[PDB]
Amino acid sequence: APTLPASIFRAYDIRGVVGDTLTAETAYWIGRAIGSESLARGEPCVAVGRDGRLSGPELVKQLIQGLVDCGCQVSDVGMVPTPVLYYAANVLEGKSGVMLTGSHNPPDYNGFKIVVAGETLANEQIQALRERIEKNDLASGVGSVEQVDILPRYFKQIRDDIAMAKPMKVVVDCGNGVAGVIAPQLIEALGCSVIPLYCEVDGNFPNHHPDPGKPENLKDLIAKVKAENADLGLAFDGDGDRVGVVTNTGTIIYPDRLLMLFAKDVVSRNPGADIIFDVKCTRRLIALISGYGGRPVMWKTGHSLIKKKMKETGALLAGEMSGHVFFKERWFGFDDGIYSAARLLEILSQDQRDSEHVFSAFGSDISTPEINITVTEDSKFAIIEALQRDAQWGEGNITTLDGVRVDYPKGWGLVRASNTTPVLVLRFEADTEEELERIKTVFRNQLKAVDSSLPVPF
Q: Please give the positions annotated as active site.
A: 15, 103, 324
* 213 exposure class (CB count in 10 Å sphere: 0-12, 13-18, 19+): middle
* Cβ distance to Zn ion smaller for residue 164 or 181: 181
Beta bridge partners of 196: 172
DSSP state, 362? T
Q: Is 211 in the site for Zn ion (CB under 5 A)?
A: no
Give the nearest distance from C-beta 239 to Zn ion in angstroms: 4
Cα–Cα distance for residue pair 53/457, rounded to 1 Å? 38
Out of 65, 96, 103, 446, name the contact with Zn ion by CB under 5 A: 103
300 is a contact residue toward Zn ion (CB under 5 A): no
Tally the C-alpha atoms within 13 A of residue 223's C-alpha that lie toward its C-beta. 7
By CB under 5 A, tell whether 37 contacts Zn ion.
Answer: no
- Does position 241 bind Zn ion by CB under 5 A? yes
336 binds Zn ion (CB under 5 A): no
Which of 96-104, 112-120, 128-136, 210-218 is the region at the interface with Zn ion (rule: CB under 5 A)? 96-104
Judging by DSSP bridges, how do beta strands 366-367 and 295-299 pair with one another?
unpaired
Is 239 a known ligand-binding residue? yes
Cα 307 to the center of its chain, rounded Å: 10
Q: How far is the CB of 216 from Zn ion (least distance, A)?
A: 18
User: Is residue 217 within the footprint of Zn ion (CB under 5 A)?
Assistant: no
Q: Where does residue 215 rank: exposed (0-12), middle (13-18), buried (19+ CB within 10 A)?
A: exposed
Q: Is 12 annotated as a binding residue?
A: yes
324 is in an annotated binding site: yes
Q: How far is the CB of 336 from Zn ion (least distance, A)?
A: 10
What DSSP string runs through 131-190?
A: HHHHHT-------EEEE---HHHHHHHHHHH---SS-EEEEEE-TTSGGGGTHHHHHHHT
Q: How far is the CB of 241 from Zn ion (least distance, A)?
A: 4
Alpha carbons within 13 A on the beta-carbon side of 11: 10
Dihedral over alpha carbons 224, 225, 226, 227 (to 10 degrees): 40
Decide whether 379 or 418 has the Cβ nearer to Zn ion.
418
> Of residues 15, 95, 113, 242, which one binds Zn ion by CB under 5 A?
242
Does position 239 interact with Zn ion (CB under 5 A)? The reply is yes
CB 176 to Zn ion: min, Å: 14
Which of 37, 237, 256, 274 forms a contact with Zn ion (CB under 5 A)?
Answer: 237
**Residues 6 or more apart in contact with residue 189 via CB below 8 angstroms:** 155, 159
Closest CB to Zn ion among residues 45, 48: 48
Radius of gyration of the chain (CA): 22
Nearer to Zn ion, 234 or 373 (CB): 234
Helical axes 337-349 vs 151-161, angle rounded to 10°: 20
* Binding stretches for Zn ion (CB under 5 A): 103, 237, 239, 241-242
Q: Per the annotation, where are the binding residues for alpha-D-mannose 1-phosphate? A: 12, 303, 320-324, 416-420
Q: Per the annotation, where are the binding residues for Mg(2+)? A: 103, 237, 239, 241
Q: Per the annotation, where are the binding residues for alpha-D-glucose 1-phosphate? A: 12, 280, 303, 320-324, 416-420
